[PDB]
């Protein structure tokens, strides 16, 4: 499981929208990561994700290896537009 | 049972209400209740609430204040529950805290203004009695000038109180100097709003006659004309990361660094040429 | 032990953070702890938090929401602890609540504009899905026009969402009409800010070309140029009086009227001729 | 005990400053009242005081009958300027 997006939201990957995405990734057993600028963090980790300081215009990659990896990436893809973060 | 106390100077603050929301969301996420108390920055009140929170058997506390003394530090350490600081400065840096590097951010903002040709740059800070102003933001200002080989002149530093009015007066104060600055950096967005309007009340045009840069990037940055160029502080994130770090402490999970500095950046809008 | 829960849509709101401070102060005064929870105006969330608050054995609850249905009403009545509404509208008026008369306030604002010569008056409301907008503020608007013998035309009503952006678009929407209004009343100050700036972005001059009146009188009213004329809502007081009324209920002391309406008034500044 | 003032604060007798004054009046056994526009309320009552809706420019009268009435009026007079409400 994997897919790259480009953040559209002016506020980038931060605040409530960032929490929502993290809470989505947490609803799965598969390891969900978030790669950005060569740094990879646990997409289920508030500290890891917000520490990247992802601004508008950046390109991130969401990984997911495990049983529900496919469902994970599917839910996350939904949250990305659902929360208007990127495409 | 699963409750953490939150000591904050003023919940009605645009800044603190945002930090508070970030704290609550992660608190909800992790099933923690939140006991909220206002301190108004009164030291006796802060230390008292600290012991009062313990009386309610809280599992941890998130503290926010503009004046952390060695006394606060000791009280934080002796507290039987974990404590995390959010958007606050603790010179000793012993208590786990989450914030950004205020020194660097100010430095970056000033350097930017210098790279643009400014020689007479002014800084409107918050009360100098607060370490974040005198020990962090003012230092970043000093370092930027010194590095650009410019003298540090007190006349180009006005002291505000975070209030919109102080910014109004701050500007009128600075424009009263024999040699006025050509650029002004405010330690806050609300004070930056006052500066812009006071500048316009006196007939000046922003950004034309004066470059203005705020600090925080609160919604207030967009609710001004011209729209304010500002240093970005992931305020909600600070609250979230603070509460999250606290939950790690309360659940004894591995803690990679207790002193966290979230990244900052500058959003240039129309208040700068 | 001595704790009351507070359900609020969004603590980071300029309006709700002020109401919240008023609640907390009186709560502190009377020795009550405060469990704060955000609902985001989600009905399922609100009803859930209601039962969740009870699980924490709270002694009472202060509720704030923009959509109180018959279901909320029943849940409030069946709750084993006292409940008080603050800055909220409950058409059935059975649950004790503290607010102002939104209908009258809007009416007064519109009447004022009419007494000044306006015939084409516009109203920028919040979501019409909220009773306070469709059943109260819109009614005061309708009554004022009808009383001045003016027709009620939907074209002069724009729907905002309390956001500064909605006000920006609200204005651009209204100025797109074949017959534009000569005055605009906003259900909120933040939307009124957007209206003023959008009007200025299009080259109009306030108050010259358009009379603008906000609603609430939050600090935002002063942080605009021209300064906003607005309907005053004693926001902090509503929170204070709500919590105070709740303490009376929790201590079984005499209650003279459960439905309280604090007085309102209009502060005229520079956004009106 | 008694004294009339004219509210100077732009926000009149409201919010925090109003709470402070009420908390001051409560520190005494004497009945402390607040007369305004012919309506008198318990200066120790948050609901009574804020219900008057006292705006800037109004004239109020603070009463106080009891043992500590003199101390009461003295503390209140202090709070009135201490809180910049009126003189």
Which CATH number characterizes residue C180's domain?
A: 3.40.50.2300
Q: Which residues of D are catalytic?
A: 14
Residues B156 and B219 in one domain: yes
Query: Distance between CA atoms of C31 and C25, rounded to whole angstroms?
Result: 10
CB–CB of C122/C157 below 8 Å? yes
Is B208 buried (19+), middle (13-18) or exposed (0-12) by CB count in 10 A? exposed
Residues C21 and C117 in one domain: no
3-state secondary structure of C158: strand
Neighbours of C145 (CB within 10 A): 21
- Report chain A residues touching chain B, CB-CB < 8 A: 14-16, 18-19, 23, 46-47, 50-53, 55
Alpha carbon distance, N-terminus to C-terminus of chain A: 16
Neighbours of C244 (CB within 10 A): 27
Query: Distance between CA atoms of B184 and B175, rounded to whole angstroms?
Result: 11
Does B244 sit within 8 Å of A51, measured CB to CB? no
Report how many helices (DSSP H) and strands (DSSP E) chain D contains, helices first.
3, 4
The Cβ-side half-sphere exposure at B25, using a 13 Å CA radius, reads 28
* Strand ranges of the sheet holding D31-36, from the earlier edge strand across to the other edge: D2-6, D59-65, D31-36, D39-42
> Which residue is listed with tokens 């993290």?
A22
Picking from B221, B236, B219, the residue whose alpha carbon sits closest to that of residue B186 is: B221
Residues C159 and C41 in one domain: no
Residues C238 and C160 in one domain: no
Residues B209 and B260 in one domain: no
Residues B97 and B13 in one domain: yes
Query: Distance between CA atoms of B41 and B67, rounded to whole angstroms?
Result: 8
**Torsion region of D83: left, alpha or beta (phi above 0 gives left; psi -120 to 50 gives alpha):** alpha
Query: Distance between CA atoms of D32 and D51, rounded to whole angstroms?
Result: 16
Residues C113 and C219 in one domain: yes
Query: Distance between CA atoms of B232 and B101, rounded to whole angstroms?
Result: 11
Query: What's phi and psi for B35, nearest 5 deg?
Result: -100, 115
Q: Token pair for residue C148?
A: 């001045």
Query: What's phi and psi for C171, nearest 5 deg?
Result: -60, -50
Contacts of C186 (CB under 8 A, 6+ apart): C123, C124, C160, C167, C170, C192, C195, C212, C213, C214, C215
Nearest CA in chain C to D27: C29
Method: X-ray
Chains D and C touch (3+ CB pairs under 8 A): yes
Query: Distance between CA atoms of C263 and D51, rounded to whole angstroms?
Result: 7
Query: Distance between CA atoms of A17 and D5, rounded to whole angstroms?
Result: 52
Does C234 sit within 8 Å of D53, measured CB to CB? yes
Q: How many CB pairs under 8 A join A and B?
A: 42
Q: Token pair for residue D16?
A: 């925090």
Q: Which of A19, A21, A48 to mutate to test the interface with B (most CBs of B within 10 A)?
A: A19
Nearest CA in chain C to D14: C237
**Rg, chain C, Cα only:** 19
Q: Which residues of A are catalytic?
A: 14
Residues B250 and B219 in one domain: no
Domains of chain B: total = 2
3-state secondary structure of C145: helix
CB–CB of C162/C130 below 8 Å? no
Picking from C159, C15, C5, C13, the residue whose alpha carbon sits closest to that of residue C87 is: C15
**Rg, chain A, Cα only:** 11
Query: Distance between CA atoms of B86 and B70, rounded to whole angstroms?
Result: 17
Contacts of C74 (CB under 8 A, 6+ apart): none
Domains and CATH numbers, chain A: 1-87 (3.30.1340.10)
Residues C225 and C247 in one domain: no
* Strand ranges of the sheet holding C60-63, from the earlier edge strand across to the other edge: B259-261, B97-99, B83-86, B60-63, B3-8, B33-38, C33-38, C3-8, C60-63, C83-86, C97-99, C259-261
**Torsion region of B51: left, alpha or beta (phi above 0 gives left; psi -120 to 50 gives alpha):** alpha
Q: Which DSSP letter does residue D64 get? A: E
Rounded to a whole number, what is the distance in Å from the CA of C178 to chain D's nearest CA?
Answer: 41
Query: Distance between CA atoms of C185 and C261, rounded to whole angstroms?
Result: 22
- What resolution, expressed in A, was reported for this entry? 2.5
Residue among A16, A53, A55 minimizing CB distance to B25? A16
Neighbours of C74 (CB within 10 A): 12
Contacts of B71 (CB under 8 A, 6+ apart): B43, B47
Residues C45 and C155 in one domain: no
Query: Distance between CA atoms of C85 and C76, rounded to whole angstroms?
Result: 10
CB–CB of C139/C103 below 8 Å? yes
3-state secondary structure of C61: strand
Residue B192's domain spans which residues? 102-232+265-273
Query: Distance between CA atoms of B162 and C243, rounded to whole angstroms?
Result: 29
> Which residue is listed with tokens 């902090």?
C236
Picking from A40, A30, A82, A31, the residue whose alpha carbon sits closest to that of residue A60 is: A40
Q: Token pair for residue C192?
A: 């009124």
Residues C135 and C215 in one domain: yes
Q: Token pair for residue C19?
A: 């109401």
Query: Distance between CA atoms of A38 and D85, rounded to whole angstroms?
Result: 59
Query: Distance between CA atoms of B225 and B196, rounded to whole angstroms?
Result: 9
Query: What's phi and psi for B260, nearest 5 deg?
Result: -105, 140
Q: Which DSSP letter does residue C132 get? A: I
Q: Token pair for residue D68?
A: 């500590």
Chain centroid to CA B152: how far? Answer: 22
CA distances from residue B163 to B38, B160, B175, B190 in whole angstroms, order as listed: 18, 7, 19, 7
Length of chain C: 273
Query: Distance between CA atoms of A35 and A59, rounded to whole angstroms?
Result: 9
> Which residue is listed with tokens 């004329």?
C229
CA distances from residue C38 to B34, B90, C16, C43, C116 in whole angstroms, order as listed: 11, 30, 10, 12, 42
Rounded to a whole number, what is the distance in Å from the CA of A67 to chain B's nearest CA?
Answer: 24
Residue among D46, D51, D53 minimizing CB distance to C26? D46
Residues C162 and C48 in one domain: no
């Amino acid at each position: 499981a994997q897919k790259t997006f480009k953040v559209t939201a002016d506020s980038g990957i931060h605040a409530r929208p960032a929490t929502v995405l993290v809470q989505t990734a947490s609803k799965y057993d598969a390891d969900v990561n978030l790669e950005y600028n060569g740094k990879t963090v646990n997409l289920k980790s508030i500290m890891g994700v917000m520490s990247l300081g992802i601004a508008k215009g950046a390109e991130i990659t969401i990984s997911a290896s495990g049983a529900d990896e496919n469902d994970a990436l599917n839910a996350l893809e939904e949250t990305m537009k659902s929360e208007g973060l990127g495409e | 049972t699963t409750t953490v106390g939150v000591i904050i100077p003023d919940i009605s603050s645009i800044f603190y209400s945002e930090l508070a929301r970030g704290i609550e969301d992660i608190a909800t996420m992790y099933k923690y209740n939140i006991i909220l108390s206002n301190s108004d920055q009164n030291m006796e009140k802060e230390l008292h609430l600290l012991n009062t929170m313990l009386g309610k058997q809280v599992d941890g506390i998130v503290f926010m204040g503009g004046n952390i003394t060695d006394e606060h530090v000791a009280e934080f350490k002796r507290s039987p529950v974990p404590i995390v600081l959010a958007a606050s400065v603790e010179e000793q840096e012993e208590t786990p805290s989450v914030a950004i590097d205020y020194e660097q951010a100010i430095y970056d903002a000033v350097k930017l203004l210098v790279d643009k040709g400014h020689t007479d740059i002014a800084f409107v800070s918050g009360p100098m009695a607060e370490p974040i102003n005198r020990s962090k933001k003012l230092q970043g200002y000093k370092r930027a000038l010194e590095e650009a080989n410019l003298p540090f002149n007190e006349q180009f530093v006005a002291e505000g109180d975070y209030t919109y009015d102080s910014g109004l007066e701050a500007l009128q104060h600075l424009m009263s100097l024999d040699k006025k600055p050509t650029a002004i950096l405010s330690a806050t967005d609300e004070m930056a709003l006052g500066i812009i309007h006071a500048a316009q009340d006196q007939g000046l045009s922003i950004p034309e006659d004066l470059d203005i840069i705020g600090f925080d990037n609160t919604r207030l940055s967009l609710m001004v004309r011209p729209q304010l160029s500002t240093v970005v502080q992931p305020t909600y994130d600070i609250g979230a990361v603070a509460m999250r770090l606290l939950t790690k402490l309360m659940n004894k999970e591995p803690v990679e660094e207790h002193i966290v500095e979230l990244p900052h950046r500058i959003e240039l809008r129309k208040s700068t040429k």
